[PDB]
Amino acid sequence: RTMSENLRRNLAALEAKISEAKTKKNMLQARAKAAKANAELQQTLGGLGTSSATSA
Amino acid sequence: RTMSENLRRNLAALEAKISEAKTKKNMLQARAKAAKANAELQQTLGGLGTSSATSA
């Protein structure tokens, strides 16, 4: 029973790290695509400069 | 929700600046053509000088 329960620690770790990596995949991918849009919002603050380039 | 609402600030800014630029287009064009007529009214005050040029 003693070493077997340490295998249960090990298996509990495998599922924990793998499942957490799956939620990281969602969060990071979502955050990445979102960040491309937020970067385009910074660029849209820069869009005011692109209109300025002929507003003169 | 936090960064998304900042995209709503950004989009609210895009529409605000663009729509205001559209009302500026109307006001400035109208004012420009109007000003050409008002300049012709100053010139018409000058028309009194053009008649003076043979009133002598």
Swiss-Prot record, chains A, B:
Compartments it resides in: Cell inner membrane
Gene Ontology, cellular component aspect: plasma membrane
Keywords from the UniProt entry: Cell inner membrane, Cell membrane, Coiled coil, Membrane
Deletion phenotype: Essential, it cannot be completely disrupted. Cells with very low levels of protein have no ordered thylakoids, are barely green and are non-photosynthetic.
Keyword Chloroplast in annotation: no
Keyword Ribosomal protein: no
Main location: membrane
Family membership noted in the UniProt record: Belongs to the PspA/Vipp/IM30 family.
Function field: Required for thylakoid formation.
Name of protein: Membrane-associated protein Vipp1
Organism of derivation: Synechocystis sp. (strain ATCC 27184 / PCC 6803 / Kazusa)
Higher taxonomy: Bacteria, Bacillati, Cyanobacteriota, Cyanophyceae, Synechococcales
